[model samples]
Target: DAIQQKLADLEKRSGGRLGVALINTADDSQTLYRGDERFAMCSTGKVMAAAAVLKQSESNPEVVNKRLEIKKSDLVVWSPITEKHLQSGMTLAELSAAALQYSDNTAMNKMISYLGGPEKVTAFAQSIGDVTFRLDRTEPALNSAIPGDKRDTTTPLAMAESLRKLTLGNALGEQQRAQLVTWLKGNTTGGQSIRAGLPASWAVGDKTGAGDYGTTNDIAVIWPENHAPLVLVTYFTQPQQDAKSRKEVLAAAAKIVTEGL
Candidate 1:
């Protein structure tokens, strides 16, 4: 079948490990899995964080429209957001945009902080059926002056379920879910994964994440013809390769999965 051919081609081309899962949105939803067990979620965890924020908003509606500003003091010392926009006060919506659209670590940290810190977010995530994901406050502290940890984690199934919930409007209120989907649709990174084989006209609501080592991940809702909008998640980690090679392998595998779908 096409799936097997795609996987073989990917293994031959990348010479790197790969794990993938595709869930059909129609009917009972067929699933095709190849090494889809577990892998670091990278920044894809931000989706869960976004869900957590919405969950917070649902209970604390006053905070939903309340303007939470980002200050210089709130700046994440070693992050791209700080480098790009030294300091600015942003609404929760803007923070969500920065975090999801750009995968801004600093923006994510700020969002987490605004949501009453990582513990609050974690509590919300758990409340909404997330068990395999975690927020790493230590990495952010040690490497960047950011309060939350860069060690945010997740498994493929959890990531997909999170996305699925967001898509179904079960994770957050309608407005919040719509806004989150908008932000995800604007994501510009991790294009080599689930996006590589998609039609240019097709739109994907998703997020991509990358880290210092060889960690790369993509979680998304893919919309194709006659399909009920599938959820796909792919994650990769390499212990013995340079950053470039890691990303290259990740992109290659992502292309494979995208093509298979």
Candidate 2:
């Protein structure tokens, strides 16, 4: 197929330094190489955080309206948009939406606090599945002084599995699941990867993540005709690469997988 040829071409152009996984939603089938390995999630890890919030809200509906007033001190000083949003107190649900829709790190970090911090979120993620993942829900380090081995990480397999469970009604209840899907549909950034590859008519929901040092990733679900929905997750890591180059690489990888299916 043309996708295979294109992938070959892209891989050749990249000097064989790319990893990918594509699944056909029609029957839970997949085509992958090194797609199961763990990699840094970057912002894409927000999905887990989002799911945790929804799951918690399911048990305590009050969380939806619990507007915790934030202050200048609560703002993430290192991030770009923290001051703007933190000035106005936001409900947990609003923060969740902003985090997913805008990939707002401030919104995410705040939500992390509301969910009883990262330890609770990490525990929630593990309780739902067998994946071993770690979260770094702390302030961004200014320098590498924090220590080399203390960084956060996760695997593509765990991420895809989480998406699958969320979609299949295993993680959250029906109402929460609906909300999660709605939030994913509203995700405003990183559309060029998974979403770009699918036909406009198809219904797709996803989240994209990228960061300094060549980390790029997208996890998504595709709904196509006469087939069960499929969950696909792709991640990439380069020590020092520009965002544009990483995005282009991910978009190209996504194109190959979806087009092939």
Candidate 3:
């Protein structure tokens, strides 16, 4: 279809590897182009972790409010929270905000450790029947060069599927899903990816991730006024490309869906 072809044209000019999945959250119609190919998950896995933690919080009723003391060594660059305190105490809910809103690596690690391990979230991904989704490690891994492909990875199809499940199905409880959606809607990152492709007034709730080796990705549920909700998942790798180019690919992908559907 023309939707898929639009992405192909963008990929040609992008000079990078790209994968895209556009799904209609309401009716479930979708276009997937090599959506099964997995790339670096980077921080995108936080959404999965957040969902698992929410489930745990509902069961225990205390984990969300439980405060954990931050350490001198737990600090990582780019998170506003870490910049504020070396020795700090924050609840799981706050950490979730830090992760989803800021992609705070330190906060994400603490969250994973709080949830018992990263694998717990990984198990959640597998249980959800994702074909290519995995949670590998926490953060503070500089530039993600050490582990390379060994890091967390998920396919566009899988990420799009997760969003669909979270929105339309029972992947998350009503309150939990609402909470997650709130966190994502307030996301202050990846402005150039999906957001760049859309009109500023268009609503998009999303998560962003990137790895050391040219890995750039964004997945979101978009609400277009007077239209059905749409899901756009983009993964692109351009080892030599700058941040701007990576975002262009995602913007183009979003434009395709917005106009086609």
Candidate 4:
């Protein structure tokens, strides 16, 4: 009943611009809405890229440790890895680490191309579940370049479910899941998003997304010290209008799980 009331409060509070998904792996409880609504995946889509890259590691496990030639033109601004440090190149695993840990846009596109293309990311998302996940646009098109309305998108529920399936199933194999979560826990960009509301006793492995528009989102697997882990996803629009709104919404979602669980 509190969650139901919280849902109503969230609905009325944000003028219908926020969406949340909370799943407890222990008892299989869920709270969600617009969780299935699609929007630009933004940086949050990088997690799928991370999963696919790790999945590739299942076959080419050495690929993670292998260095690839990162062209000069490939680097982007705001990149801690590819901008100043990517003259010759970095390891594929290092690139993946940058994507998840730094939320570097360049690192994401590199891994997507490494896995063949954006479609491969979609294929990986689909293979996990009947999730309506789509990866049609590349990072360039979706980033600070001249762009169209075409953007990668997925529902909160679909993605959370897919990730749950990916983690619980052998989607990426056990070793790669650990590899993926490793970078996620090192996430350096989401400190203010869902990561902000976490209890000292809990740890969160998550990816963050933000857009020039109002889109602000966070998707994560929360590990409570003495309890079963949970998958928490929150996406909200109109955050750009009020820069702090996104984090506030995300914090609320985090509190919901921290207390509700």
User: Can you give the TM-score per candidate against the true fold?
Assistant: 0.80, 0.85, 0.91, 0.89
Positional deviation of residue 146's Cα in model 1 after best superposition, in angstroms? 19
Give per-residue CA lDDT, model 3, range 136-243, as digits (tens): 667756236222364577778888988778755688789888898898999998788888888766788899887665777898888888777887888887655344
Model 4: residues with Cα > 4 Å off, grouped in runs: 143-150, 239-245
Total clashes for model 3: 0
Model 4 worst lDDT run, 10 consecutive residues = 142-151
Clashing pairs in 3: none
Candidate 4 residue lDDT tens string, 1-261: 787677668757865466677888888888886666665667888888888887777887577887887777887655677775656788888888988888887888889888899999988887777458878877755532112344577778887887676665567777887777777788888888887878878888888887655567898888889999888888776534444435777777677655755
How high a TM-score does candidate 4 get?
Answer: 0.89
lDDT of model 4 at position 232: 84
Residues 1-261 of candidate 2: C-alpha lDDT, one tens digit per residue: 565567667767764245566666556676664655556666777788888888888878688878877677776633444456555688888877877877777777887888787787778888897456667555443111121233556666677777878866578999888888888877788678777766676677888876555566788877776557777787766544443336677767776777645
Better of 2 and 4 by TM-score: 4
Q: Which has the greatest TM-score?
A: 3
Pick by lDDT: which candidate is best? 3
- Which ranking of candidates, highest TM-score first? 3, 4, 2, 1
Q: Give the TM-score of candidate 3.
A: 0.91
After TM-score superposition, the amount by which residue 12's alpha carbon in candidate 4 deviates from its true location, in angstroms, is 3.2
Against the reference, the lDDT scores of all candidates come to 0.63, 0.70, 0.78, 0.75
Model 3 worst lDDT run, 10 consecutive residues: 142-151
Q: Candidate 1: TM-score?
A: 0.80
